[PDB]
Design a protein around this nucleic acid. Structure first.
Ligand SMILES: [Zn+2]
Lengths: 50, 86, 249, 112
RNA sequence: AAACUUUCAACAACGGAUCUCUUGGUUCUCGCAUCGAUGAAGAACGCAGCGAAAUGCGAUACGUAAUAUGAAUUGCAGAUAUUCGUGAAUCAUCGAAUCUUUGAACGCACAUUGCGCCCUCUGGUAUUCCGGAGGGCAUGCCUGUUUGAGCGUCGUUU
RNA sequence: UAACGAGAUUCCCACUGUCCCUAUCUACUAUCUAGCGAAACCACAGCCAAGGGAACGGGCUUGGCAGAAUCAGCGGGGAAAG
RNA sequence: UGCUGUAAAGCUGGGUCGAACGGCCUCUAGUGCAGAUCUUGGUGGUAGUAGCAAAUAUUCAAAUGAGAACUUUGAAGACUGAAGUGGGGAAAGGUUCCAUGUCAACAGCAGUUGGACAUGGGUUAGUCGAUCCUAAGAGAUGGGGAAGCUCCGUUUCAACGUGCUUGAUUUUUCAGGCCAACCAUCGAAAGGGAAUCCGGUUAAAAUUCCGGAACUUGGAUAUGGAUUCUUCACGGCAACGUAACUGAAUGUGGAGACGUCGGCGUGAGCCCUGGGAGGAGUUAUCUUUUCUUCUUAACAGCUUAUCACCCUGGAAUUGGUUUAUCCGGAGAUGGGGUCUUAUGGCUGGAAGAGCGCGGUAAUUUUGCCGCGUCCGGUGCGCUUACGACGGUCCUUGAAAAUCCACAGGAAGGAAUAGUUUUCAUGCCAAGUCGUACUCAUAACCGCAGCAGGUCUCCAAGGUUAACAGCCUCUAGUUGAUAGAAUAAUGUA
RNA sequence: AAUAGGGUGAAGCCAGAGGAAACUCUGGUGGAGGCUCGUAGCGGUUCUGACGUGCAAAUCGAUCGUCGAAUUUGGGUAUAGG
RNA sequence: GCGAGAGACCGAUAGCGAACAAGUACAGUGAUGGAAAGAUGAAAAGAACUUUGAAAAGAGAGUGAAAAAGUACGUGAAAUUG
């Protein structure tokens, strides 16, 4: 809600920063196996459970 | 009306985040963590839950200080500094 | 079976008394030098309603003998007590309604209320509305007084025990029917969670010794031994007799 | 007609969330939040409202002048005029009677 | 007769068997004895020139010092970076440090980034108010120091 | 036993498609098209009669018969499914 | 492609393929599948089938675009119809917010659109909350149980102050003087509580930013006023008044602080309406017409009241008086006064703002000028606040922090000088965390963009008893796969 | 914290009429009640309606019960598997 | 736990649940529950360029020992399908 705690807001800040696609230059590294970010999260699909 | 109609009244959390283990298992009214037993001095752990020990135990985190005990032991717990070779 | 409704009350989870609106414990003054050797005078400031209690309470202000202070006491208001009345408490107090006197200082036939069983327990006997204790007699050489209790029992108390002269106010309360489940609901809303009561014979055998059967009936004798155990004492416990009371007892 | 909204996060009609509807210089019908009404100072003997004393919420008495909070008389801002008059007459009469009950005693304690 | 249905072969699909691998597991053997109030295990949150995770680290933050070594790093870029040299890279080694908020977690409290108090320095015209920096204030118990309490009790003076 | 009753029951008046005995009308379906597109169920399959048979056969024996591909309905059977 | 063997199987021709593999003598085993409503994975028929039918309803054009039933804009037709499909919030969510770009997947048709995807941007507080208080309760300590994890207890069989107040002292020592009933702590974003309003402003923030106008608390502190030679003010018969106008320990009291119903009264907002000053609509005919703007915040001063109280006077022929019958020798009616300022009026705030018109500027960032912004009325109206009353109960309808007054009389105080920050004015500061958006027939929970569920505030006209139903205004939507037909059987 | 609009008309009170009195009668006023009709709300009677591989692991429609208190409800809090 | 060496052990539905960013994703109020997922090539040499298309793509071409190796990547079975 609008009225939240600092501890709650600090968790929501981290949840957004982790929710980005894979930067592309990492696909170009030698011996690279990661094709995409497999830990994406949509707000309507899976809840954070905070 | 115990199915879908009753499932619509779930907006009061029984549990919040625990300060010691950060798991969302701190019971608000009981003021206890159902996971680690906080605020008891001992961690909650049972021999009937062996998989639960796997999830949270030594080596599942950083081991930031125990990492180097073997390295310091192997050198007899030295004191001082290394010398420059002549 | 299951733990029956008798045994759930001892835990006192939802069976504690509702005490938010109660105006304090009604006690006499702590017995002290002034009451033991002379008398002390106070004034009735308020006569208030205590929820859950049929008797009104009187707030009485006394002076502190040893420090500059006013002490408020909560008495059970004897009928005929009014605001601003002077209340005298002690060995030398006169025999007037509302005064607090030791039992030995009262003549036989004196009507007294809020009487102490023990010297200094601050009142035990005859505290409900319309009730009183009659001083039957004195046995002075062992310092004892025989009194008649509201139930008819005769008791022997130390003459140093104190009591308030007169009858407890609010009497006659039972003379009017309640007429309504709502009235009883409001009555016990400020006392405790003991209403309404389901008949045990209307339950299942898990819930009560009286439950079960293809007809509602007790089945075995409803008179229970005094030596029975918890979970069995449902019915008439240690009854010396049953049935309609015919004649004198 | 213009309709109004609460100006604070409290959405309930509680005793501390009472609002007045006020027309502003902008031609807007807004809600104005209203502080709780103050109660009158009352006499300590009879419980009636004392005259000449301001009606303020308890904390407001701290930053108001003294003549607003009192009356120039014995027990000024505390007891009403009649209650002070009753105490004075009672105090004088009773203490005069204490003299009479005493001088009578030395009349009684030297003849028997 | 076509179409349709069914069967078969070729080719193409669907699908991921089979085959061959394998920085993983599993078992057995050998050796060793090393967590923490000098703050552990765990958690949370952060940190890279361009990073989400994993790995590493703690505002000195994919690391600092030291020792050894001896030209890299690399997906791209770029030095106020380096090459017969106190010199690239290196968890190679590691004995000196840093180590946020926590956590046995310790000023009190904690569903709050809440509330104190003490010492030194410092800003605001300030021993008292406000701000800042640094250092502190848990509990049980032990040894000792100091200040005490008790007609518990000893000697003296009335 | 007055009052009360989404309690059970009988009768009377009113009322009526409940019925004699059905008919007509409207919207949304179903129908057809474009797009989208499941599930239950599935030994193999799918025409009858009689016989015998685990005594009520789709298949066996003996007869009747029997002509591609199908659409809308329907609820006799599949001793239909759950 | 064949051959061999009764068979289990073995060998071979051709094709594909790219790194290991076989025969024979022995050893060894997690060693041979058609089934177990077997396990895991995959794929069918059914089958282009069932179906995609609640919530009145869409149509024309233009633009964009490869492409438009579905995007945007305009025109229209509609609906929700103020107990809303409106405007906000609490819980819950967590970036869904806003702009730019974009259509692989998702939006059970489509898609140029989107709560999707990608890249950025965005949440400003002394005054709003939290923070503080206590409630039901929770729960350390001293203790007492229990093998123990821990259990009881909450001031308890306790030597329980990390006390204060001054005079200080600078000698960084002290001198003391009063306490210690109760009191760890936690427990409310709806209870209690210090203090902020208006106008403007963004793509997205605002009681937070900008402009202006205030207020509170804490601290420092000077000037003026007030006061003193009758040391700690005067006036009024009084209710009490005032710019101020000593007061420690301790004590007493008040506020905080309180149910519900009924009718009545007052105010406020809205509704209704008259004149006038403007603008828009209708005008075949009628209509001095229909619609619309004419507003005034917190705060400051002065005044303003039911109830209550005071002085005078002494009342049956009893009087006064409410919608509601209560009051008076315990002093009525009458006459004269005092008080609370709830609520209104005036003035300041403040017309400089906002609003409505007119006239010009111009790529223009943004405007500039002028004029007006006035005076009323009405009520069993609606909602709401307050007031004075009345009823009701075997029901009598929180606490604490906090603040004030009073009692008391400690101590200190002038005369050529003294006191006080409860009078005015002036100075400084006000930390931390939250703040975007949804709040639901798509942002929450029901596996989902599910006809379910989920607390509350504001509330126009007509009809009407009515906040019902029905029609309409402001605001908001026009979302629910469509097209052609109209058999049977259905559902309404 | 929430709960339209009406009906009925209890005590109390005013006035009038009758009576030797005890008392009676009439008209008003008043506005009581776990009273009544009936919205929101809360519930869930009947159609044994729809649906029943649903919008839905209990809903939809009409009909219905109650609707000022033994009322409804948010948050906090307590009670935990014989 | 630390550090080593081995095996008539398993060989990606096996072997630890985990050969992979595995106690991960995800579910549940919570205690807890808990997967799937290895292989182009020697080397990305990962298809320049032309053409049709709005684009995705296609047809040529090119790289390569091989494109009967194109990241939907070794081989590529059966069901099922053209
Ligand atoms: Zn925990």
């Amino acid at each position: 809600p609008s009225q939240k705690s600092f501890r709650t807001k600090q968790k929501l800040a981290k949840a957004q920063k982790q929710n980005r696609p894979l930067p592309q230059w990492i696909r170009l590294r030698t011996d690279n196996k990661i094709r995409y970010n497999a830990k994406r999260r949509h707000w309507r699909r899976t809840k954070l459970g905070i | 009306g115990k199915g879908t109609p009753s499932l619509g009244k779930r907006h009061n959390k029984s549990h919040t985040l625990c300060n010691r283990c950060g798991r969302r298992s701190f019971h608000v009214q009981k003021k206890t963590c159902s996971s680690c037993g906080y605020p008891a001095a001992k961690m909650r752990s049972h021999n009937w839950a062996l998989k639960a020990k796997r999830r949270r135990t030594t080596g599942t985190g950083r081991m930031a200080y125990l990492k180097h005990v073997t390295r310091r032991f192997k050198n007899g717990f030295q004191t001082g500094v290394a010398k420059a070779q002549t | 079976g299951r733990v029956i409704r008798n045994q759930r009350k001892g835990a006192g989870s939802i069976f504690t008394s509702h005490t938010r609106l109660r105006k304090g414990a009604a006690k006499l003054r702590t017995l002290d030098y002034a009451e033991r050797h002379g008398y002390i005078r106070g004034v009735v400031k308020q006569i208030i309603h205590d929820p859950g209690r049929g008797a009104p309470l009187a707030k009485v202000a006394f002076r502190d003998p040893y420090k500059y202070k006013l002490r408020e006491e909560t008495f059970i208001a004897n009928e005929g007590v009014y605001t601003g009345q002077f209340i005298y408490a002690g060995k030398k107090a006169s025999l007037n309604v509302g005064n607090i006197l030791p039992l030995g200082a009262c003549p036989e036939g004196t009507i007294v209320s809020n009487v102490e069983e023990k010297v200094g327990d601050r009142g035990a006997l005859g505290r409900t509305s319309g009730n009183y204790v009659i001083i039957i007699g004195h046995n002075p050489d062992e310092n004892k007084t025989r009194v008649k209790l509201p139930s008819g029992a005769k008791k022997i108390i130390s003459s140093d025990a104190r009591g308030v002269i007169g009858v407890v106010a609010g009497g006659g309360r039972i003379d009017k029917p309640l007429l309504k489940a709502g009235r009883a609901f409001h009555k016990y809303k400020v006392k405790r969670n003991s209403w309404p009561k389901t008949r045990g014979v209307a339950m299942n055998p898990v819930d009560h010794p009286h439950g079960g059967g293809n007809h509602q009936h007790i089945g075995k004798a409803s008179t229970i031994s005094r030596g029975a155990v918890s979970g069995q004492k449902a019915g008439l416990i240690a009854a010396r007799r049953t049935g309609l009371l015919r004649g004198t007892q | 007609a213009q309709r109004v909204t609460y100006r604070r996060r409290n959405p309930y009609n509680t005793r501390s969330n009472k609002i007045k509807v006020v027309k502003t210089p902008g031609g807007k019908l807004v809600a104005q939040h209203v502080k709780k009404a103050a109660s009158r100072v009352k006499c300590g003997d009879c419980g009636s409202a004392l005259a000449g004393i301001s009606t303020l919420r308890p904390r407001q008495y701290a930053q108001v002048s003294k003549t607003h909070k009192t009356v120039q008389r014995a027990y000024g801002g505390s007891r009403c005029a009649n209650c002070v008059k009753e105490r004075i007459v009672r105090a004088f009469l009773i203490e005069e009677q204490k003299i009479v009950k005493r001088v009578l005693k030395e009349q009684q304690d030297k003849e028997k």
